[PDB]
Amino acid sequence: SATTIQKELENIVVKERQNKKDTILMGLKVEVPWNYCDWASISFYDVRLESGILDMESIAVKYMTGCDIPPAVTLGITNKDQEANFQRFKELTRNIDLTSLSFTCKEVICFPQSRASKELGANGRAVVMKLEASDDVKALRNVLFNVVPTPRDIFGPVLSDPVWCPHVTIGYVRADDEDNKNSFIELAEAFRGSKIKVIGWCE
């Protein structure tokens, strides 16, 4: 059970993600086998077309743009002042062939609605494709966090240790439309087992 301090710490994590703006993405740009037309029957949730959003610049709602999402696998999200460390890490890993890295589409997961986005007026959940990352990718991410200070991912209880879920976000859908969500997941599940090639860092 969550204690008084643990519940208060969860309020801090939510508010920290709401106030967090102007951050950099340390991810791996990838090529996906699915296309926009594959989800033609699906209705998507785009905050740029919605009303009641309290802070369009907050990272908790800013990137909820329907299926208009760049194909990429996020390794970590850190602050803007760490951009020199991230540039230094990309030069330290200059001899690493990122194109040899590869992921495997395992399962389609609809992430729960984050409380940070819901408080900002968002009504969308992320439908992603969970990936199986190799040891090379896991080691690249761990050394990345060793060179570049990165905030700890706290998506659940503050007491639980973070479990990295490597994924490619396919699109956001409304949280109050189960038929549209189930149909999207069923169509996305047809791409399970597809091998995903990395092209390089996200720019």
Per-residue H/E/C for 107-142: EEEECCCCHHHHHCCCCEEEEEEEEEECHHHHHHHH
User: By CB under 6 A, which span of 4-12, 57-65, 79-87, 94-102 interacts with ligand A1AWU?
Assistant: 57-65
CB 58 within 8 A of CB 18: yes
The reply to whether 158 sits near ligand A1AWU by the rule CB under 6 A is: no
Calculate the dihedral angle through the C-alpha atoms of 33, 35, 38, 39, rounding to the nearest 10 degrees: 120
The reply to whether 165 sits near ligand A1AWU by the rule CB under 6 A is: yes
Count how many Cα atoms sit within 13 Å of the Cα of residue 148 in the half-sphere of its side chain: 29
Among 112, 149, 157, 200, binds ligand A1AWU (CB under 6 A): 112
Among 59, 140, 144, 198, binds ligand A1AWU (CB under 6 A): 59
Comparing every residue's Cβ against ligand A1AWU, the nearest one is 169
CB 199 within 8 A of CB 30: yes
The rounded distance, in Å, linking the Cα atoms of 121 and 50 is 9
The reply to whether 78 sits near ligand A1AWU by the rule CB under 6 A is: no
Burial (Cβ within 10 Å: 0-12, 13-18, ≥19) of residue 114: buried
Does 155 carry a binding-site annotation? yes
User: By CB under 6 A, which span of 23-31, 100-108, 173-181, 184-192 interacts with ligand A1AWU?
Assistant: 23-31
The reply to whether 36 sits near ligand A1AWU by the rule CB under 6 A is: no
The reply to whether 201 sits near ligand A1AWU by the rule CB under 6 A is: no
The rounded distance, in Å, linking the Cα atoms of 2 and 150 is 26
Q: Annotated binding site for guanine: which residue ranges?
A: 111, 155
Q: Annotated binding site: which residue ranges?
A: 111, 155
Residues that bind ligand A1AWU (CB under 6 A): 23-25, 59-60, 63, 74, 77, 111-112, 114, 116, 126, 128, 155, 165, 169
